[PDB]
């Protein structure tokens, strides 16, 4: 519930989406550990894209947020819709055992 | 008419008598035997507290966070049937 | 298991008595000298519930009488309704 505070969450999600969609694609890195690699004029060291990956994992995880919610709805409504066949303390209850026994009563025939 | 409300009052007073009779019978059995009714209490009230504490991880603001799936191997209710629901096509 | 909006939920949105009673029962279930005292307390609690139940029984017996008396008047109308 509470739809007044959910628009304020979506406005902060879309703020970070519009912030990450304004970064340049030609982003490279330079760590302080490259001096042991001896980068020449044409070397192509393997520590250039250590932040360009992390600038895309966040941008594509903020877009698959509605994608993972469908998988969570398909998981929770399949592990919690029964809730009385794998959980032992809920199936060992006097009301639940009598209810599951009494819903399987076959109708009585006449004569 | 007044007969329906009168029978309602008689039925309510009979339910009060049934409550008083059951509360008498519980203390009467506790007076007859003191041993196997207190262990019965410590078992049945503990099971009733486990039943009433069986629906707490499915709230509104509790399921939208990530403190259900991540690092909760002590829960044992979920995150163990993902190898079973995938084999049935329920996703 | 991916925390994505878990930062934004934290940005937006920032008993003992019955356990002591259960521990008291667990201490009372060790010595046999206390169960007699518990039964002697429960005997007068059962006498209190006998006094609770008998007044409800007497009030039921009273409240039956007017519902019977209305049917007695309906019965006494028949002594002329049949003679006619």
């Amino acid at each position: 519930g509470d739809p007044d505070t959910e628009i304020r969450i979506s406005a902060r999600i879309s703020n970070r989406i519009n912030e990450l969609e304004r970064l340049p694609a030609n982003l490279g890195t330079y760590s302080l550990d490259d001096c042991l690699e001896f980068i020449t004029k044409d070397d192509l060291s393997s520590r250039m894209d250590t932040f360009k990956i992390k600038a895309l994992v966040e941008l594509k995880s903020l877009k698959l947020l509605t994608k993972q919610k469908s998988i969570r709805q398909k998981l929770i409504n399949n592990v919690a819709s029964q809730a009385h066949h794998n959980i032992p303390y809920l199936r060992d209850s006097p009301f639940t055992a009598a209810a599951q026994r009494s819903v399987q009563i076959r109708s009585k025939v006449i004569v | 008419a007044e007969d329906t409300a009168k029978l309602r009052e008689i039925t309510k007073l009979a339910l009060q008598l049934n409550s008083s009779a059951q509360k008498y019978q519980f203390f009467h059995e506790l007076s007859l035997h003191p041993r196997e009714t207190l262990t019965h209490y410590l078992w049945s009230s503990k099971q009733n507290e486990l039943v009433l504490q069986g629906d707490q991880y499915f709230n509104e603001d509790a399921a939208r966070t990530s403190d259900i799936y991540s690092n909760n191997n002590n829960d044992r209710s979920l995150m163990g049937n993902i190898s079973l629901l995938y084999s049935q096509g329920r996703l | 298991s991916l925390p994505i909006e878990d930062n934004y939920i934290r940005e937006v949105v920032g008993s003992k008595l019955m356990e002591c009673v259960n521990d008291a029962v667990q201490t009372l279930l060790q010595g046999d000298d206390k169960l007699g005292k518990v039964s002697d307390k429960s005997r007068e609690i059962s006498e209190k519930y006998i006094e609770e139940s008998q007044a409800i029984i007497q009030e039921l017996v009273k409240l039956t009488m007017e519902k019977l008396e209305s049917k007695f008047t309906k019965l006494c109308d028949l002594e002329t309704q049949l003679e006619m």
């Binding site: 990450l20 932040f51 | - | 930062n7």
Partner: peptide, 26 residues
Amino acid sequence: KKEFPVNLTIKKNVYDSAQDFNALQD
């Protein structure tokens, strides 16, 4: 405890917006 990493090297400054890196200035 698994926590989402706060990447401060990617985020832009809001209050000052003048002491940031030259690749994040535009």
